[PDB]
């Protein structure tokens, strides 16, 4: 597959209840491997995949140190945002940050990320050249100017091209037995009458990994979008994913419909029909 490390931070201010809560989650591809939560009982970077659990005390000490540092920065950012947006210290606000690195086929950085949101909206994002920023508004333009003056794209690009990819390769090597897998979906078609004249055909894909999948319905070989419903891809609970797509069909016409499934764990796209 094509591999990726990504962290997702959320800070949420809560005046009247102490410092903002900070939550960080780390992923290799679609596998969460670490977490930091400032509201955990002994806040530290905690393992969430067995393979990383074997990293020695240095890993946990430094990771915790950096997570706490990230937490503090987000506390400063929350305060700063109150200034930029003319807001009260007494209201609750949210910062979300995602950053990470995609490992290319040549072992080089294919694509890097560093993007944030304030109260659910774009704030500032690093462009794909990893050398420029997109600010969503006039408040974020303050940050842009700052980061342009302090050479932050350059510093963060060095991490993305160097250390980020080094960690990703280590993790991939260490947790190889479980991370470098492509589990194909278990697939099937079910049938559920709506009335005596209409029925729902539902095409299921279960137990697949990674989360990327394509599921479509055809009628007489034509892509159907009318009377169609595709649910958001959803976790199994066990590190797998699921999705379904349904079509509402006239009774008697069921056998004119095929479901089509594409996934990296499949040697060739699947074609399914209702097999009662």
């Amino acid at each position: 597959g094509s591999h990726s490390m990504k962290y997702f931070y959320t800070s949420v201010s809560r005046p009247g209840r102490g410092e903002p809560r900070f939550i960080s989650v780390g992923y290799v591809d679609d596998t969460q491997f670490v977490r930091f939560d400032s509201d955990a009982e002994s806040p530290r970077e905690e393992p969430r995949a067995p393979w990383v659990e074997q990293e020695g005390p240095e890993y946990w000490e430094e990771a915790t140190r950096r997570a706490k540092e990230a937490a503090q920065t987000h506390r400063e950012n929350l305060r700063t945002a109150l200034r930029y947006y003319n807001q009260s210290e007494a209201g609750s606000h949210t910062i979300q940050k995602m950053y990470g690195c995609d490992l290319g086929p040549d072992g080089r950085l294919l694509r890097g990320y560093h993007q944030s949101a304030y109260d659910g909206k774009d704030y500032i994002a690093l462009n794909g050249d990893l050398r420029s920023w997109t600010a969503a508004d006039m408040a974020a333009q303050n940050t842009q100017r700052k980061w342009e003056g302090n050479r932050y794209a350059e510093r963060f690009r060095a991490y993305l091209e160097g250390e980020c990819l080094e960690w990703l390769r280590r993790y991939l090597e260490n947790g190889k037995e479980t991370l470098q897998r492509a589990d194909p979906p278990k697939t099937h078609v079910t049938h559920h009458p709506v009335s005596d004249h209409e029925a729902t055909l539902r095409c299921w894909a279960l137990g697949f990994y990674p989360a990327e999948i394509t599921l479509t319905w055809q009628r007489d070989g034509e892509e159907q979008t009318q009377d169609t419903e595709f649910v958001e891809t959803r976790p199994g609970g066990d590190g797998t994913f699921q999705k379904w797509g349904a079509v509402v069909v006239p009774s008697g016409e069921e056998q004119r419909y095929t479901c089509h499934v594409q996934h990296e764990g499949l040697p060739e796209p699947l074609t399914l029909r209702w097999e009662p």
Partner: peptide, 9 residues
């Protein structure tokens, strides 16, 4: 692991 880098808003 997180990056030692981080700049402010």
């Amino acid at each position: 692991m997180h990056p030692a880098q981080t700049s402010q808003w």
